[model samples]
Target: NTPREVTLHFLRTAGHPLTRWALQRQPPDPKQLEEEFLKIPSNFVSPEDLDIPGHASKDRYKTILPNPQSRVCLGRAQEDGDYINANYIRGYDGKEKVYIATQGPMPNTVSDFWEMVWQEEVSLIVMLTVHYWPTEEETYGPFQIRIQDMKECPEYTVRQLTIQYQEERRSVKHILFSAWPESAGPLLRLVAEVEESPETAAHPGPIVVHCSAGIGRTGCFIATRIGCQQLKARGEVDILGIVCQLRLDRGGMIQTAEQYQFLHHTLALYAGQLPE
Candidate 1:
């Protein structure tokens, strides 16, 4: 009855009209706080951030599914709403050119997004989106239909692709196609692909990444990439700070508490530092 007891106590002690005040007052670590806080039956804790209509399902896969034109790229959509978006960059005369690639239903959806990236004379059409094949139903892809169409415009390269499915919270479907440990496998493959490619080498530019709304899973993927890039460059890890920095640039970039935890957890898992 621990689960039920925990659930009950969490609900009760969580109190009425939960606000940032309640969460800020809780211990910084949820793992430690959840246990003690769940003991009081009279206390009530409503699920945080769910009351806001569009916010409850902000991280849900169905809610975040990309437009038909979008292509699946790096990172999975975790319970906490973090996702990754890819960008391309180039430098000239000590100034950098940048492009933030995107997929949406409008004339400028993709073009407009990329225009903001720092780059010069770069001509690569990047399509990014995450693909999640549901278990109960059968659908081919969140498919990269647009990328295929844009093939004539330029070469289309898949920088990163990640898929995640779950029947219950905390349990993830890690392996669907490869042998490497679930999270590590896709990440390793992606880094290797980018490093070895002539296109990336000859024309160093932003890598495009996307999933659904380009906020949840896309944001996390971008954050992880930035974190690892910084680590590789500095020979030390500062993932939390990196993620925070990314969030500062984009509001609700990591969107949910679960997502914030997942980004840290997944990065550690990939680095082989997570305890079983």
Candidate 2:
């Protein structure tokens, strides 16, 4: 009994034996993560099922077509006739029309994009790739977009703009995250800012998020936003579940293992920072 007591006392005096173990709290291995990611159902839209004859011209990639049910249908006001390579991705609570994930605008589709914004009354636009609006103003098809103001931040830039289609006009907050070949801090920072944006005050319109192809980086951002919400609300996040939900809606969300891993790291940091 005395010897046991001595051992206990020694352990008590010695500092923690595994004090540094937490440093190994790295995320899951990439191979393992990719395997799990691969198993998630991919509800990709095949060419034959796309139905619309001219739809192929609008898609950025042949295989990256939006899932038919959730695809954003543009107005028939023009020749394009209700076709844009965009999908309505859900938000944290399984709500609909939370976000519209789309491919970067091809030269021909920029006008269509603006038209969708006007039609949807979209107040917030999150661009994960990049774009250069005219320093002051320009017109795309029937709509005119003018930069009302611009504020550049370390990780991203926010532009306040007015998009006018016909006689009606609306305010839009365009936040651009150009250097996302990076990680958690900027991502969480971007996500936090997106939530706090004044335009999101009333949950105005579906936020339009796009990248070059609209799935990889775009998927990462949307997943991080959703995961943060899940973590805050329940002290847990279903990363796979979130991705599957997105894929079901748009297909191939949170594209690569690197993005999947980054999303995990981002949510972990967000969870640690949440109010206790």
Candidate 3:
């Protein structure tokens, strides 16, 4: 344990923004990678802990629940009131409302999903699973969504939408990357697209990211984004610390050992720029 702490201490020290040196001059050897990932605290929130009635219907998976401390509560749901299977994930600097990692919209909770998007004034939504709103206009509970425009790229689909709740209207960018078997490469490109978008750059609300269960691929996307931010600004990244912090915000982040390893490789690829 002492050796682990000392290593982490060195890593944290080296990760400092002003370190002025190449990040991780050496790539990690195979031995310690999985063990380090396993050692990070789960911070898992059990079923009995949340105790919110009717939350089961809102959840995509019974096992994965958002941490109560960081859960994103909806404001205007008439039925369940304020329960949503989502968490507010902190950004790279660990300050701003960078991301809201959430489960995909259920058949019954589709209204609540749009309501949260409208209420939060979210401009960018990264969906790994799918959507509900129609192309023209539709009212789901208090929010009305109208798809303004959609551009289909080879990698993903970009949908521009306008949502109105009560008297106000807001524009939203919904990017759907449905292809999975080819996740890592396209995901890096998707991350670049999200980071470069003018709307996302100046948006006020957090980037809403969701998968079926909302933690696995969702966590991968968020982790990759944060890692790239760290690598760009500080010249280094603390992948372990980023994963740990994410789990603290919402448990089961980067859900599998494979996903963890995938994240490492993805970040490594980002660190090594491709020749144009």
Q: What local distance difference test score does each model get?
A: 0.35, 0.77, 0.77
| Candidate 1 C-alpha lDDT tens digits along 1-276 | 775466434433342221222222432365643433233232112344123333333233333332211212232221222222222322111123232333232321222222212122122322232333233332222211112111111212332221212231111111121221224446544444444544422354544434444455556656555544543444344434443333323323455556555554454444443223
Q: Which parts of model 2 have CA positions greater than 4 angstroms off?
A: 1-31, 130-132, 200-203
Count of residue pairs whose backbone atoms collide, per candidate: 38, 0, 0
Of 1 and 3, the candidate ranking higher by lDDT = 3
Query: How well does model 1 score by local distance difference test?
Result: 0.35
Deviation from native of the Cα of residue 93 in model 2, angstroms:
1.9
Backbone clashes, candidate 3: 0
TM-score of each: 0.40, 0.86, 0.86
Error of 1 at 60 (Å): 17
Provide the clash count, candidate 2: 0
- Alpha-carbon error at 116 in model 1, in Å? 7.9
Every model: Cα RMSD to truth: 16.2, 12.5, 4.5
lDDT of 3 by residue, 1-276 (tens): 775365445434432121213333565555656776776656667899887888987888898898888998887545656988889999988876789998888888888788778667688999874358786888787778889999998888999988876687788888998665434688888998898766632348889999788888899899989988887776677787788778768888887777777777777778776333
Model 3's lDDT to the true fold?
A: 0.77
Ranking by lDDT: 3, 2, 1
Q: Find the 10 residues in a row with the least total lDDT in model 2.
A: 15-24
